[PDB]
């Protein structure tokens, strides 16, 4: 699987163990991403930090 980068055009393939995409959002702006990469297991959303995972290409 492949996920987009922070700067909306670049991308990177998920290493071994990582076949899912994830995005780190901060309450400061749940409408804007702070971090993005690959993940093996989706975390749990928080009241402050929001973690979203996708199983699609260039989802995030």
UniProtKB/Swiss-Prot annotation:
Expressed by the venom gland. Keywords: Cardiotoxin, Cytolysis, Disulfide bond, Membrane, Secreted, Target cell membrane, Target membrane, Toxin. It is found in: Secreted; Target cell membrane. SUPFAM superfamilies: Snake toxin-like (SSF57302). Disulfide bonds join 3-21, 14-38, 42-53, 54-59. InterPro entries: Cytotoxin_Cobra, Snake_3FTx, Snake_toxin-like_sf, Snake_toxin_con_site, Toxin_cobra-type. It holds the Pfam family Toxin_cobra-type. This is Cytotoxin 2. Monomer: shows cytolytic activity. One of its GO terms (biological process) is killing of cells of another organism. Belongs to the three-finger toxin family. Short-chain subfamily. Type IA cytotoxin sub-subfamily. Monomer, or heterodimer with alpha-cobratoxin (AC P01391); disulfide-linked. Transmembrane segments: none annotated. One of its GO terms (cellular component) is other organism cell membrane. GO terms for molecular function: toxin activity. It comes from Naja kaouthia (Monocled cobra).
